[PDB]
């Protein structure tokens with residue numbers, strides 16, 4: 556086709572993220588009357604989110620996904636998006652990004668500094684903790700070899716609750732869990748299902764610790780080359796796909812607890828009071844290390860009312 560574009564993602568071909576990406580690709584091809592084709596490159600074939608973000612800056616990849624929190628890699632105060640228990644729900648994540656001065660400044664910085672245009676935002680689940688032994692209480696986290704992604708906020712989650720974080724790549728996790736070289740991991744339910752981590756974890760704790768969004772991103776290199784009518788086609792299709800993306804996650808969080816129960820998994824509901832208490836020292840370190848931009852991002856996020 557005239558523009559042969561590529562969409563890279565960490566997620567696999569059974570994931571919600573991929574399904575929404577298929578919808579995005581399909582609308583774009585149609586409403587562009589065939590001028591744009593978007594091919595999918597899942598399962599981190601192109602490298603992980605960090606790597607793919609660098610390919611979008613360079614212009615060697617055209618689209619990818621990223622959480623708002625992943626931009627803590629460049630702007631330390633963007634960690635606020637993933638300080639555990641700080642963002643209440645997805646309504647708060649939406650207003651954080653689009654309706655605060657911090658948020659709006661982060662978007663403009665994404666474009667001018669990092670070579671990426673934010674097209675849409677979806678919901679990608681609330682993270683929970685699976686494991687090979689029960690998590691009845693925060694005490695059960697002691698010495699747990701918990702698999703985390705390569706991100707400072709997830710490592711901090713593990714540390715401060717008394718677990719032993721082993722960072723690793725997503726594609727590696729399943730075997731690690733099965734052999735028990737690690738004891739647990741902490742994705743939203745959707746990914747626990749997509750990656751089938753429920754086949755090699757008898758236990759799931761509802762730790763509700765981090766709220767993931769997902770941003771549909773396009774390389775500026777690619778976006779600037781598209782005529783404005785085709786820019787609007789890609790922009791609209793990204794908003795349509797985001798809304799669908801959010802619905803897949805919302806509908807699944809209802810039904811998946813029962814799906815895991817049927818699959819022989821044992822669900823616990825530990826007291827979150829001490830989880831939340833364990834993090835105050837981390838919030839203090841966060842303000843200490845990120846300074847006044849950081850206390851100003853927290854202030855703006857904590858002021859957002861979580862009720863629609």
Ligand SMILES: CC(=O)N[C@H]1[C@H]([C@H](O)[C@H](O)CO)O[C@](O)(C(=O)O)C[C@@H]1O
Pocket residue numbers: 564565566603604620621622624625703704705706724725742
């Ligand atoms: C857009 C994207 O790639 N998200 C990925 C996130 C982020 O990389 C991480 O949370 C840091 O923000 O990590 C996972 O949860 C993980 O490796 O377990 C998989 C998920 O697909």
